[PDB]
Write an enzyme that holds these catalytic residues in place. Structure first.
Site, PDB file in Angstrom:
ATOM      1  NE  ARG A 215     -25.104-110.023  23.272  1.00  0.00           N
ATOM      2  CZ  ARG A 215     -25.710-108.845  23.284  1.00  0.00           C
ATOM      3  NH1 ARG A 215     -25.547-108.038  24.330  1.00  0.00           N
ATOM      4  NH2 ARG A 215     -26.487-108.486  22.261  1.00  0.00           N
TER       5      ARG A 215
ATOM      6  CG  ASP B 151     -24.069-102.275  27.569  1.00  0.00           C
ATOM      7  OD1 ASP B 151     -23.468-102.216  26.462  1.00  0.00           O
ATOM      8  OD2 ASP B 151     -25.161-102.883  27.710  1.00  0.00           O
TER       9      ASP B 151
ATOM     10  CG  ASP C 267     -23.088-105.873  25.798  1.00  0.00           C
ATOM     11  OD1 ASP C 267     -22.614-105.113  24.912  1.00  0.00           O
ATOM     12  OD2 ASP C 267     -24.165-105.627  26.412  1.00  0.00           O
TER      13      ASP C 267
ATOM     14  NE  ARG D 297     -20.849-106.537  21.866  1.00  0.00           N
ATOM     15  CZ  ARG D 297     -22.017-107.065  21.499  1.00  0.00           C
ATOM     16  NH1 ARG D 297     -22.104-108.362  21.243  1.00  0.00           N
ATOM     17  NH2 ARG D 297     -23.100-106.302  21.372  1.00  0.00           N
TER      18      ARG D 297
END
Ligand SMILES: Nc1ncnc2c1ncn2[C@@H]1O[C@H](COP(=O)(O)CP(=O)(O)OP(=O)(O)O)[C@@H](O)[C@H]1O
Ligand SMILES: COc1ccc(C(=O)CSc2nc3c(=O)[nH]c(N)nc3[nH]2)cc1
Ligand SMILES: [Cl-]
Ligand SMILES: [Cl-]
Ligand SMILES: [Mg+2]
Ligand SMILES: [Mg+2]
EC number: 2.7.6.3
Length: 157
Positions: free
Chosen positions: A91, A96, A94, A83
């Protein structure tokens, strides 16, 4: 210990390989244990649409780490899987943090519940698979959000 829920997304560099490697890395985070992993879903991109479909998944992680300590480790995994810093572009990985128990955190570094998650079907549906009785910090039930808002069901990867 608190249960954190993490969303995983990838749409570059063999997303299935990326998400598998990310799961193994999440399993190596100190003072933490994976409790549950959702199915893997193939989702059309939100934001710019001129990019590949995402693989999205959700994981429940029990942890003793402070919220920002958990963030340090998820960001490290993202960096190690390639990343790098357009807005909302493709990407390799990721991670989160969607929820950290019932905590509300509002800092530049960390905002929990994740900004905008109640409008993202690719986050809510995998979350519902692994935590159907989930209640948000503001008392909203995950079930009621999905029942009341128009979110297409996802296709499996
Ligand atoms: N709940 C959370 N989970 C992960 N990162 C968070 C977060 N709250 C704030 N951040 C911050 O967000 C910064 C970068 O996030 P990005 O991954 O580049 C944005 P994105 O995921 O493409 O869009 P989105 O944030 O709208 O989902 C990180 O430096 C981190 O400090
Ligand atoms: C207001 O409209 C939006 C704008 C941007 C977003 C983002 O999430 C940030 S980039 C991004 N990540 C993913 C993803 O993991 N899966 C899918 N399917 N699409 C994604 N797009 C959401 C909604
Ligand atoms: Cl990338
Ligand atoms: Cl909330
Ligand atoms: Mg994101
Ligand atoms: Mg992110």
């Amino acid at each position: 210990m608190t249960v954190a829920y993490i969303a995983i997304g990838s749409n570059l560099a063999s997303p299935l390989e990326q998400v598998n490697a990310a799961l193994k890395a999440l399993g190596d985070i100190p003072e933490s244990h994976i409790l549950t992993v959702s199915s893997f879903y193939r989702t059309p991109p939100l934001g710019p649409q001129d990019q590949p479909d995402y693989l999205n998944a959700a994981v429940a992680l029990e942890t003793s780490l402070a919220p920002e300590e958990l963030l340090n480790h998820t960001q490290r995994i993202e960096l190690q899987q390639g990343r790098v810093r357009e807005r909302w572009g493709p990407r390799t990985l990721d991670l989160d943090i969607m929820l950290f128990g019932n905590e509300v955190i509002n800092t530049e570094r960390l905002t929990v519940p994740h900004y905008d998650m109640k409008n993202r079907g690719f986050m809510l549906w995998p979350l519902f698979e692994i935590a159907p009785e989930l209640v948000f910090p503001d008392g909203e039930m995950l079930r009621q959000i999905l029942h009341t808002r128009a979110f297409d069901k996802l296709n499996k990867w």
